[PDB]
């Protein structure tokens, strides 16, 4: 099943066509394409075939023999003289030989070497060798046909006689450029209408050879313009149609037909038994389980995987991957020489000792990616990426977000937040701002093509270093079982819990690199989990009034979806993935998808996936591409839906398959979780995800401004507090407060009932009296009283 079939039966059509012909016809071939590599290249093939039909080949010339700096004739010439001299004819040997030397003579007189460019008294008979030259044609003829003629005499039994000398021309893909025009030429002037001359080349490369030499030949013509490029294209057009007609060129297997096929089909172009097992691994005999019939184009990637355990095939197609997968047949092999076992992870055995050798198949993978991408890569990119390697694990995000930023600028002089963080501190980045920056690029009106790979390689340049680093952390798992218990116990149901967390997470430099790439947020610090209108109006900010107060599992409402600790200024981490310590009536942001990259619960799912061997395997935040399905989600009583979708329904979404499981969970905590609810009060799993949605919805609900301040109403106020709702809430909190310590249920129904509660509290205390007499003759609420509340509440 020779892969190349149909273009040897084209050339033996061109050849049969032209041996019909005998008058000294110009009679020429052109293969186009990639004929090479290990064994079976359509060049050493062809002279094979073109040898067992009495075609006579001069021995290939290659760029060995074009570096001779030798014209064509004289490689011809001397290879006829070898090929005479093999044996030992007579009567056509010695006509053989004076036409030899006639074309020396021809050829010297073109070199300008015989004696009459050097005399000074010309003779009358060096004439005669100035002839040889300007009559090479009936010379070269001549000694053709006699050397046919020779090769015939020396066949035994009488086989059959040679039909015509066929000269191939190998590997001119790339010949020092004009060196070919200098061929080109020789061949248009000794032998197109003397052999049959296969030139083997790729592409344009004769159109740019020939080019090369007009250009500077039509300098004047060209900067007068008297003519342009169109002239001196077609000049060469017409040139090449005459050399070789466009019935005689035949292309063979570029990308777009190297990329469709099977990787079946280019394992049996190399042997019959070659096969990819269903691991994706080569294999040998039969399998009967092996997946031949993927095509290279997803083979690539269903192969990346089970090697690196990253599906990098995008969901945006823009991104112009397919510059990585091959490109030829010689790389399609080198790939596979590089890619064939490197340990492939199965799924088999206990799903633990995959992790070492996946770390590696990532470096060779990155090396790969290197060594391909080295091309368009010009001064700033090389650069960029070299840089973002030696970035430590933390000035990374800050480089790329700048780099990011350069491809934006290129476009933008022919607001936005994302494109707001430049004199933004590195530890303020993260990986969100990252991706959506490159979103926001790749929705910009403005520059396409390579900025989109660029976005892409990078996007794998993350994913790879995420992966090592998880996989770094996953083979210290040992250090930090404890955590895990730990864990359970204080979100089961503080200080301590931080302060182990951070000594934990301190001897495994690896998990703070992890934890630096993606600072606390790998989505968008923007993103809409409600497709219905805008954002939001108030929906992702919560108050957390103070500790006596939460709910319970209200731990849980602060590692899931509250990843900072701010109000919502120069030097200021603005992130701290470590758990966190919140103060009173502040507003914070919430975002949905932080849990499987807090420090804590990135521990216990470590743990969880080396210690225990079941079926799921908890998320790992180690590809973007994992966010880029993240943001395609839908995600649509709102709270408690878009929780579930966190905690169930994500788990496009084959990017999530990995090689160590069937399924995914995202913490497998929040199912223990579930079960004390029960007490308290896929259909199993799905019930339970629920009882998690509605607790952290009731969470959610609580700590709202709008049930804070809910026995606040029926109060007037100044027009201008209504905008301060933290002083407002200390103004609860102080009511409260003050109604505990003496039980006397302050009424709030209006100004008047808030008036006589307070005169009956304040008929014992002297410090409440003051408030009284200061609230007298006020119709509202003031700001100075109700700081004055807050005052005397607290020191109370």
């Keep these: 099943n020779y892969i190349f079939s149909s273009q040897l039966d084209k050339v033996n059509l061109i050849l049969e066509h032209m041996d019909t012909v005998g008058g000294i016809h110009s009679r020429n071939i052109a293969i186009t394409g990639d004929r090479g590599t290990g064994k079976t290249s359509f060049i050493e093939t062809l002279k094979l075939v073109l040898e067992k039909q009495n075609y006579y080949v001069f021995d290939i010339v290659s760029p060995t023999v074009l570096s001779s700096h030798l014209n064509i004739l004289e490689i011809v010439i001397s290879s006829i003289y070898r090929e005479i001299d093999q044996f030992i004819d007579v009567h056509d040997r010695g006509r053989l030989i004076q036409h030899l030397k006639k074309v020396m003579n021809a050829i010297a007189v073109e070199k300008k070497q015989s004696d009459y460019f050097k005399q000074s008294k010309p003779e009358i008979?060096?004439?005669?060798?100035?002839?040889?030259?300007?009559?090479?044609?009936?010379?070269?003829?001549e000694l053709f046909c006699y050397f046919k003629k020779v090769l015939n005499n020396r066949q035994d039994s009488c086989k059959e006689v040679i039909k015509d000398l066929v000269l191939i021309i190998d590997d001119l893909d790339l010949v020092e450029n004009n060196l070919v025009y200098d061929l080109l030429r020789d061949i248009?002037?000794?032998?197109?209408?003397?052999?049959?001359?296969?030139?083997?080349?790729?592409?344009?490369?004769?159109?740019?050879?020939?080019?090369?030499?007009?250009?500077?030949?039509?300098?004047?013509?060209?900067?007068?313009?008297?003519?342009?490029?169109?002239?001196?294209?077609?000049?060469?057009?017409?040139?090449?149609?005459?050399?070789?007609?466009?019935?005689?060129?035949?292309?063979?297997?570029?990308?777009?037909?190297?990329?469709?096929?099977?990787?079946?089909?280019?394992?049996?172009?190399?042997?019959?038994?070659?096969?990819?097992?269903?691991?994706?691994?080569?294999?040998?005999?039969?399998?009967?389980?092996?997946?031949?019939?993927?095509?290279?184009?997803?083979?690539?990637?269903?192969?990346?995987?089970?090697?690196?355990?990253?599906?990098?095939?995008?969901?945006?197609?823009?991104?112009?991957?397919?510059?990585?997968?091959?490109?030829?047949?010689?790389?399609?092999?080198?790939?596979?020489?590089?890619?064939?076992?490197?340990?492939?992870?199965?799924?088999?055995?206990?799903?633990?000792?995959?992790?070492?050798?996946?770390?590696?198949?990532?470096?060779?993978?990155?090396?790969?990616?290197?060594?391909?991408?080295?091309?368009?890569?010009?001064?700033?990119?090389?650069?960029?990426?070299?840089?973002?390697?030696?970035?430590?694990?933390?000035?990374?995000?800050?480089?790329?977000?700048?780099?990011?930023?350069?491809?934006?600028?290129?476009?933008?002089?022919?607001?936005?937040?994302?494109?707001?963080?430049?004199?933004?501190?590195?530890?303020?980045?993260?990986?969100?701002?990252?991706?959506?920056?490159?979103?926001?690029?790749?929705?910009?009106?403005?520059?396409?093509?390579?900025?989109?790979?660029?976005?892409?390689?990078?996007?794998?340049?993350?994913?790879?270093?995420?992966?090592?680093?998880?996989?770094?952390?996953?083979?210290?798992?040992?250090?930090?079982?404890?955590?895990?218990?730990?864990?359970?116990?204080?979100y089961m149901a503080d200080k301590e819990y931080r302060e182990h967390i951070m000594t934990a997470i301190e001897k495994v430099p690896a998990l703070q690199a992890y934890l630096e790439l993606v600072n606390a947020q790998f989505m968008p610090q923007n993103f809409n989990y409600d497709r219905s209108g805008s954002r939001d109006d108030d929906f992702y900010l919560i108050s957390w009034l103070k500790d006596d107060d939460l709910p319970e599992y209200s731990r849980l409402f602060k590692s899931l979806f509250l990843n900072s600790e701010v109000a919502a200024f120069r030097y200021r981490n603005l992130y701290s993935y470590l758990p966190l310590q919140l103060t009173?009536?502040?507003?914070?942001?919430?975002?949905?998808?932080?849990?499987?990259?807090?420090?804590?619960?990135?521990?216990?799912?470590?743990?969880?996936?080396?210690?225990?061997?079941?079926?799921?395997?908890?998320?790992?935040?180690?590809?973007?591409?994992?966010?880029?399905?993240?943001?395609?989600?839908?995600?649509?009583?709102?709270?408690?839906?878009?929780?579930?979708?966190?905690?169930?329904?994500?788990?496009?979404?084959?990017?999530?398959?990995?090689?160590?499981?069937?399924?995914?969970?995202?913490?497998?905590?929040?199912?223990?979780?579930?079960?004390?609810?029960?007490?308290?009060?896929?259909?199993?799993?799905?019930?339970?995800?629920?009882?998690?949605?509605?607790?952290?919805?009731?969470?959610?609900?609580?700590?709202?401004?709008?049930?804070?301040?809910?026995?606040?109403?029926?109060?007037?106020?100044?027009?201008?507090?209504?905008?301060?709702?933290?002083?407002?809430?200390?103004?609860?909190?102080?009511?409260?407060?003050l109604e505990k310590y003496a039980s006397d249920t302050i009424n709030v129904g209006n100004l008047s009932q808030f008036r006589e509660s307070l005169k009956k509290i304040g008929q014992t205390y002297p410090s409440i009296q003051v408030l009284v007499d200061k609230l007298h003759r006020k119709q509202k609420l003031y700001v100075e009283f109700i700081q004055d509340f807050i005052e005397t509440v607290n020191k109370l």
């Design 125 to 141: 008979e060096m004439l005669t060798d100035l002839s040889h030259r300007t009559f090479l044609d009936e010379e070269i003829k």
């Design 188 to 490: 248009q002037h000794y032998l197109d209408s003397q052999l049959i001359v296969i030139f083997a080349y790729k592409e344009g490369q004769l159109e740019q050879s020939m080019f090369e030499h007009l250009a500077k030949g039509n300098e004047a013509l060209l900067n007068h313009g008297v003519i342009d490029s169109n002239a001196i294209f077609g000049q060469i057009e017409r040139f090449l149609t005459k050399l070789v007609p466009l019935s005689n060129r035949i292309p063979l297997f570029k990308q777009d037909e190297l990329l469709n096929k099977t990787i079946g089909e280019f394992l049996a172009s190399l042997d019959p038994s070659y096969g990819v097992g269903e691991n994706l691994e080569f294999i040998t005999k039969d399998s009967e389980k092996n997946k031949n019939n993927l095509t290279i184009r997803e083979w690539f990637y269903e192969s990346i995987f089970y090697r690196t355990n990253l599906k990098l095939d995008p969901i945006d197609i823009r991104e112009e991957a397919s510059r990585l997968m091959p490109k030829t047949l010689r790389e399609m092999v080198q790939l596979c020489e590089e890619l064939h076992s490197m340990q492939v992870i199965t799924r088999s055995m206990d799903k633990l000792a995959g992790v070492e050798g996946l770390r590696k198949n990532i470096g060779a993978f990155r090396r790969y990616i290197g060594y391909k991408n080295s091309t368009y890569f010009n001064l700033a990119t090389m650069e960029f990426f070299q840089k973002w390697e030696l970035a430590e694990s933390h000035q990374a995000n800050y480089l790329a977000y700048h780099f990011l930023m350069s491809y934006y600028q290129e476009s933008f002089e022919q607001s936005g937040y994302p494109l707001t963080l430049r004199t933004m501190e590195p530890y303020n980045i993260t990986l969100g701002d990252i991706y959506a920056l490159m979103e926001e690029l790749k929705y910009t009106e403005g520059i396409s093509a390579d900025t989109y790979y660029i976005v892409y390689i990078l996007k794998v340049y993350y994913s790879l270093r995420l992966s090592e680093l998880l996989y770094n952390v996953v083979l210290h798992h040992k250090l930090f079982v404890h955590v895990k218990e730990e864990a359970t116990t204080f």
């Design 584 to 737: 009173s009536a502040t507003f914070y942001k919430i975002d949905f998808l932080a849990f499987a990259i807090k420090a804590d619960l990135l521990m216990y799912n470590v743990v969880r996936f080396v210690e225990e061997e079941g079926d799921t395997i908890p998320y790992f935040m180690s590809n973007m591409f994992h966010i880029d399905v993240f943001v395609r989600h839908n995600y649509n009583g709102k709270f408690a839906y878009i929780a579930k979708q966190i905690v169930f329904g994500l788990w496009w979404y084959k990017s999530f398959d990995t090689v160590f499981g069937t399924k995914i969970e995202a913490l497998h905590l929040l199912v223990d979780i579930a079960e004390q609810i029960k007490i308290s009060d896929e259909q199993k799993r799905d019930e339970q995800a629920k009882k998690v949605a509605e607790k952290l919805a009731a969470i959610y609900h609580h700590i709202g401004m709008s049930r804070i301040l809910s026995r606040l109403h029926q109060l007037p106020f100044i027009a201008e507090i209504k905008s301060n709702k933290e002083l407002l809430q200390h103004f609860s909190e102080a009511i409260v407060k």
